[PDB]
Amino acid sequence: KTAVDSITQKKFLCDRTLWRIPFSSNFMSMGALTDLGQNLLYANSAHALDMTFEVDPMDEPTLLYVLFEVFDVVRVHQPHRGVIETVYLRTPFSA
């Protein structure tokens, strides 16, 4: 009978995972490659990238971890006896 006036608060926990945004036209996964990536505006072009984050403050130096999923494939060829050669390659962002 004698409770008080109150307010409400909400939040959530999503540990043990990463936030992933795919590079797809309609966000759906339809193969290892992707339509926008395959278009690249046809790769006679190039582009510069800007990204902006805004997060709540803490009280300690922190790190922002960002990774771009790209292609990283290696081909192995061993022609003669006791000889092995390989070719790595990866894109974009590689060398």
Partner 1 sequence: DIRGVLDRGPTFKPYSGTAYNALAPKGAPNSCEWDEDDGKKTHVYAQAPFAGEAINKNGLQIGTNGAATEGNKEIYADKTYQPEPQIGESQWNEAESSVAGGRVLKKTTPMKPCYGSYARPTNSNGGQGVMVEQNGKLESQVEMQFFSTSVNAMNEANAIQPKLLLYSEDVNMETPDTHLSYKPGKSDDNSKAMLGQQSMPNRPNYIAFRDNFIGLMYYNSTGNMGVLAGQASQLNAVVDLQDRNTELSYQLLLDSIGDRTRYFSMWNQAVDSYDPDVRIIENHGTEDELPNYCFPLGGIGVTDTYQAIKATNGNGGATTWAQDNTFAERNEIGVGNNFAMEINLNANLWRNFLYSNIALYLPDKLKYNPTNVEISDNPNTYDYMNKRVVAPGLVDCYINLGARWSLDYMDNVNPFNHHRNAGLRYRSMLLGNGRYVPFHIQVPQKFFAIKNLLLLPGSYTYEWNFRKDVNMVLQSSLGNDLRVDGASIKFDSICLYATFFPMAHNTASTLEAMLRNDTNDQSFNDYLSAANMLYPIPANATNVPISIPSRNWAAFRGWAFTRLKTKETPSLGSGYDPYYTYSGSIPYLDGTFYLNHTFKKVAITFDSSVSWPGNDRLLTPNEFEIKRSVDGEGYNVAQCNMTKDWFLVQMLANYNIGYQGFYIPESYKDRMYSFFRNFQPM
Q: What is the DSSP letter of 82?
A: T
Instruction: In angstroms, give the least distance from the CB of 39 to partner 1.
Output: 10
Does the footprint of partner 1 cover residue 2 (CB under 8 A)? no
Measured between alpha carbons, how far is 75 from 89 in angstroms, rounded to an integer? Answer: 9
For the range 50-58, what are the long-range contacts, defined as Cβ-Cβ under 8 Å and sequence gap of 24 or more? Answer: none
Instruction: In angstroms, give the least distance from the CB of 32 to partner 1.
Output: 8
Rounded to 5 degrees, what angle do the CA atoms 48, 19, 33 make? 60
Instruction: In angstroms, give the least distance from the CB of 35 to partner 1.
Output: 11
Instruction: In angstroms, give the least distance from the CB of 8 to partner 1.
Output: 6
Measured between alpha carbons, how far is 77 from 83 in angstroms, rounded to an integer? Answer: 9
Measured between alpha carbons, how far is 21 from 55 in angstroms, rounded to an integer? Answer: 17
Does the footprint of partner 1 cover residue 67 (CB under 8 A)? yes
Instruction: Tell which positions 14-33 bind partner 1, by CB under 8 A.
Output: 14-29, 33
Site string for partner 1, 35-64 (x = CB under 8 A): --xx-x--x--xxxxxxxxxxxxxxxxxxx
Residues that bind partner 1 (rule: CB under 8 A) add up to a total of 76
